[PDB]
Amino acid sequence: TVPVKLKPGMDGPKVKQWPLTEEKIKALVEICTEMEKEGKISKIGPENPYNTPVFAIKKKDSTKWRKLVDFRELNKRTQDFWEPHPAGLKKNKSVTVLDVGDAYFSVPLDEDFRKYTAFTIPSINNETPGIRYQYNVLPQGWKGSPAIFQSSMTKILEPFKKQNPDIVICQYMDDLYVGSDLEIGQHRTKIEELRQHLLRWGLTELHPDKWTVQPIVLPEKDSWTVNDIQKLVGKLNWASQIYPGIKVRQLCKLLRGTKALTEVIPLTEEAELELAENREILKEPVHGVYYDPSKDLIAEIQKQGQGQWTYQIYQEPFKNLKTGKYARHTNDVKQLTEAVQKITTESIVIWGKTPKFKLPIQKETWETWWTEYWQATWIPEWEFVNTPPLVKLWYQ
């Protein structure tokens, strides 16, 4: 076993278990009994003060329950251990994502580090004490697992990689991201070949080139009111904090004077010249915005109504590395949860790391309902924005 150490001074995680539903506690006991019989996890006494949370989910289009340990806190306190991502992956035609988490259960975890992987299955109404368990094997959702396993993963793919030097294979958490510039049927056949290579060591589609900016579109009216210009100036005003070439000096001259909101205002030759100048700068990208690997990625999401969501990834505010949309029933949390996962999925494919979400929702509502629609093996960092932005209008 590879020996593992925490950051100097940092103690292990002591995070409270979020209360679970009846079906999930029952599903987790079914699972945790079989993992105990197969040696992957052992019961633990009260000498272990550490605890990580745990819930049950269902992986994309499946009925069987799957365990999901929330190792975010342990990941934060281990990162001296683990912490390259191939820049080519985002320029592939097709990228397929394969869950290789079952590979980790074969490798044993360092006996001394096992204490930190403790987790509790809570009982309903606390009638019984919580069923405690710690990991004997490399756990799924701990960032130490792929790092330790990397030497073994390179060995498994060494044939397949020599076989196909165009295929870009990348690994984040329990997933494997396999990209190619091939035809989709040809690509699928290479993915099926890859599954077979993995089968011999115990192991049973997105299009990054087609991701393009959702630019800050300006309106096009037959005639303009004062209000329509007042809103149009604000959109450009706010856009000029990001975009270098934005100006609106000729536009604001049209408003000079205390006019009513519904009064119609004809545009000058310079106004429509300045307006078109803005459009085409906003359709094309942002100058001087580059990814710094030392600093965090952040994601803000805005609700637009009618199943529509907009988002922006960045490191330093008003300097967007990526913008986008998410569309399509009457559940808000579900859609936000489906959005959060989609954005993270992209972020992992572009930079090899997840963003800190600024979620527009009350902490309690999300905390309650997020696991009922969550399907990923990973979980990103989130905070909750309870401040009502004007940004809803700017990205419409």
Partner 1 sequence: PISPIETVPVKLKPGMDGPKVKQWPLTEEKIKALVEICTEMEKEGKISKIGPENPYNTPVFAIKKKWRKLVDFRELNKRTQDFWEVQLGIPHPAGLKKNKSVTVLDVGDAYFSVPLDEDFRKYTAFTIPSINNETPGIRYQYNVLPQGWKGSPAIFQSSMTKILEPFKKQNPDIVICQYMDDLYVGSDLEIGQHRTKIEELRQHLLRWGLTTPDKKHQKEPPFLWMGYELHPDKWTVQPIVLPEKDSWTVNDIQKLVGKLNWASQIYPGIKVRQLCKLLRGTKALTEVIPLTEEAELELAENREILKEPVHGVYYDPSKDLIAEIQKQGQGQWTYQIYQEPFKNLKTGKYARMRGAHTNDVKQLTEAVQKITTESIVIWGKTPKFKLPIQKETWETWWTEYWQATWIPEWEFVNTPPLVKLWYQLEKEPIVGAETFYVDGAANRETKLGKAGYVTNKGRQKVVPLTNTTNQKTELQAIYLALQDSGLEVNIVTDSQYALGIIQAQPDKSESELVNQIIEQLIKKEKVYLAWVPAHKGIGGNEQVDKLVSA
**Residue with Cβ nearer partner 1 (279 or 303):** 303
* 320 three-class SS: strand
Map residues 349-388 to x or -, x wherever contact with partner 1 holds by CB under 8 A. ----------xxxx-xxx-xx----------------xxx
**Residue with Cβ nearer partner 1 (252 or 267):** 252
Q: 316: closest CA among 342, 346, 290?
A: 290
DSSP string, 211-238: ------PPP--SS-BHHHHHHHHHHHHH
Choosing from 164, 214, 237, 396, the residue that interacts with partner 1 (CB under 8 A) is: 237
Residue 138 contacts residue 148 (beta carbons within 8 Å): yes
As a whole number of angstroms, the distance between CA 135 and CA 148 comes to 15
Which residue type occupies 354?
T
**Residue with Cβ nearer partner 1 (139 or 360):** 360
User: Is residue 33 within the footprint of partner 1 (CB under 8 A)?
Assistant: no
CA 51 from centre of chain: 24
Using CA atoms, how far residue 394 sits from 130, 221, 229, in Å, is 48, 17, 14
Stretch that binds partner 1, among 15-23, 60-68, 143-151, 350-358 (CB under 8 A): 15-23
DSSP type of residue 376: -
Choosing from 152, 164, 225, 396, the residue that interacts with partner 1 (CB under 8 A) is: 225
Q: Is 174 annotated among the ligand-binding residues? A: yes
Stretch that binds partner 1, among 134-142, 145-153, 253-261, 283-291 (CB under 8 A): 253-261
User: Is residue 342 within the footprint of partner 1 (CB under 8 A)?
Assistant: no
Burial 320-335 (b: 16+ CB within 10 A, else e): bbbbbebeeeeeebeb
Residue 169 contacts residue 146 (beta carbons within 8 Å): no
CA quadruple 356, 383, 374, 323: dihedral positive or negative? negative
**Residue with Cβ nearer partner 1 (79 or 365):** 365
Size of the site for partner 1 (CB under 8 A): 68
User: Is residue 223 within the footprint of partner 1 (CB under 8 A)?
Assistant: no
Choosing from 336, 343, 376, 379, the residue that interacts with partner 1 (CB under 8 A) is: 336
Residue 318 contacts residue 394 (beta carbons within 8 Å): no
Q: What's the closest the beta carbon of residue 253 comes to partner 1, in angstroms?
A: 7
As a whole number of angstroms, the distance between CA 42 and CA 136 comes to 7
Q: Is 209 annotated among the ligand-binding residues? A: no
**Residue with Cβ nearer partner 1 (211 or 373):** 373
User: Is residue 343 within the footprint of partner 1 (CB under 8 A)?
Assistant: no
CA quadruple 296, 213, 177, 99: dihedral positive or negative? positive
**Residue with Cβ nearer partner 1 (245 or 285):** 245
Choosing from 184, 261, 276, 327, the residue that interacts with partner 1 (CB under 8 A) is: 261
- The annotation places the binding site for Mg(2+) at 99, 174-175
Per CB under 8 A, residues contacting partner 1 are: 16-17, 19-22, 25, 45-49, 51, 120, 122, 124-130, 132, 225, 227, 230-231, 233-234, 237-238, 248, 252-253, 255-263, 302-303, 305-306, 331-336, 359-362, 364-366, 368-369, 386-390, 392
